Design a binder for this molecule. Structure first.
Ligand code: HEM
Length: 400
């Protein structure tokens, strides 16, 4: 299961961390990853797991490597070594595609969409409220971002379960479809819509993308489908799992819950602190050349894991980093990434989070983990929560 150690890697830097099955997973996934920040662990280590790769363990190195795109390329952005979404793997071109994507998910769009997002959150919460229980992950978290995508992209509600099935197959295959088959089925769906909206545009994301320009010429169908596909999948598992870590914490910490109930104006700040504490993405890069990085010889072609999750957990970045404190004066994190690939959806995501917390806490202020339940986490490129059974007394809630 361990790949043989390359001869350029000194043995004293070896730490066999498995990003898909870390040793202390039962104790919490962020805690399991923070073992990389224990004092006997160097800033940059090599693991023999998963093909063999570097891991930067501290925020300083994680940020620097994401800044240095000339050495740390997105050509292979995932460990381990058919994925073709745009602009994940791409500078003049990356910048043009990002600008176009920014027209459709940037702050002005999110500000226009906010009340629609609230209305959606409200309808979902109200549907669960009288039951006095739900699996938050399945019953609220999963249906919310996919519905926001349909709003954003001007797609009919009827198309949700099929689209959701394809995106589920790309990350959590049941075996009916290979990744490549799921991706192509997604493209089968998007291509006709892109073409129709090229000729007869609305103001939705697909119309805007389909009418965009790259290199002084019209965006191609291939480019537009790959961009639309990324806009869809980028906002699903990340938001599902993040909302689930946040709601798990709030269920388990009545005093933090009470703080937001009493002081709802703190919710935007609380969102930032939760993004830091329950950070969840760990992407990577591949070396474009031999490069000495902080005293360590990296070889052309080596992969390096640069966990976005770790920057904000680094005690060099935030004191007492496992403590949640909504009043931190400086919330330092790279939860949405860093450098040229910084999350295009960061504004939409924050609004989704804040709206969800505001609406949940006003309708269902008092809730707990279901008696007897033990919450299980999962680890990967996007770490997450397997299920989140919550319980409340319906008499303590308030209807619309
Ligand atoms: C809490 C929720 C989210 C988190 C934690 C998150 C995290 C990230 C991170 C870390 C990256 C950079 C990956 C890298 O550098 O390799 C990224 C990129 C991206 N995200 Fe998000 N994301 C979230 C929500 C969203 C949403 C809601 C959307 C779309 C509506 C979205 C779309 C994208 C896209 C299109 C990129 C690629 C940007 C590029 O390559 O230039 N994300 N995200």
């Amino acid at each position: 299961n361990l790949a043989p150690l390359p001869p350029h890697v000194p043995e004293h830097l070896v730490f066999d961390f498995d990003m898909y099955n870390p040793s202390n997973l039962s104790a919490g996934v962020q805690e399991a990853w923070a073992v990389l920040q224990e004092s006997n662990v160097p800033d940059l280590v090599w693991t023999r797991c998963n093909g063999g790769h570097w891991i930067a363990t501290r925020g300083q190195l994680i940020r620097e490597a994401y800044e240095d795109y000339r050495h740390f390329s997105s050509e292979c952005p995932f460990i381990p070594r058919a994925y073709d979404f745009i602009p994940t793997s791409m500078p003049p071109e990356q910048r043009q595609f990002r600008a176009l994507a920014n027209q459709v998910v940037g702050m002005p769009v999110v500000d226009k969409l906010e009340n629609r997002i609230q209305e959606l959150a409200c309808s979902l919460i109200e549907s669960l409220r009288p039951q006095g229980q739900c699996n938050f992950t399945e019953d609220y978290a999963e249906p919310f971002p996919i519905r926001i995508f349909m709003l954003l992209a001007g797609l009919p509600e009827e198309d949700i379960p099929h689209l959701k099935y394809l995106t589920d197959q790309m990350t959590r295959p049941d075996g009916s479809m290979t990744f490549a088959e799921a991706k192509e089925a997604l493209y089968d769906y998007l291509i006709p819509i892109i073409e129709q909206r090229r000729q007869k545009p609305g103001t939705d994301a697909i119309s805007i993308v389909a009418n965009g320009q790259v290199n002084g010429r019209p965006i191609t169908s291939d480019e537009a489908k790959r961009m639309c596909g990324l806009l869809l999948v980028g906002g699903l598992d990340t938001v599902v799992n993040f909302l689930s870590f946040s709601m798990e914490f709030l269920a388990k910490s009545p005093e933090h819950r009470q703080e937001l109930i009493e002081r709802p104006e703190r919710i935007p700040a609380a969102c930032e602190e939760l993004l830091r504490r329950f950070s969840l993405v760990a992407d990577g890069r591949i070396l474009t050349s031999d490069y000495e990085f902080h005293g360590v010889q990296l070889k052309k072609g080596d992969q390096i894991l640069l966990p976005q999750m770790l920057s904000g957990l680094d005690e060099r970045e935030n004191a007492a980093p496992m403590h949640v404190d909504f009043s931190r004066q400086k919330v330092s994190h790279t939860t949405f990434g860093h450098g040229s690939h910084l999350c295009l959806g960061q504004h939409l995501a924050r609004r989704e989070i804040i709206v969800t917390l505001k609406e949940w806490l006003t309708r269902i202020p008092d809730f707990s983990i279901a008696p007897g339940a033990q919450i299980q986490h999962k680890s990967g490129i996007v770490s997450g929560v397997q299920a989140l059974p919550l319980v409340w007394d319906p008499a303590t809630t308030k209807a619309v």
